[PDB]
Input
Amino acid sequence: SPAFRFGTVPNGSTERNIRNNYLEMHSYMVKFNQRSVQDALLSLKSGKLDAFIYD
Amino acid sequence: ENGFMEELDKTWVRYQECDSRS
Output
């Protein structure tokens, strides 16, 4: 019921793989996609995002 | 069969804010 949150960097092998196997995850996570790893880290670190996914 | 109803209930039942309280 509460909205959960997870995202990853776009144009990645991770994102392409995701789109290949799991569509819904990709289509949902596009909103949670982040500019850069330092910035993705900004979304995790300062709050406003729960989980981060990366290499 | 096509899930037309499921999507219509999904539209008109908002589900936004609530939970099992206890």
Summary: DSSP finds one helix and no strands in chain B. Chain B touches chain A through four residues (CB under 8 Å). Residues 13 and 19 of chain B are 14 Å apart (CA to CA).
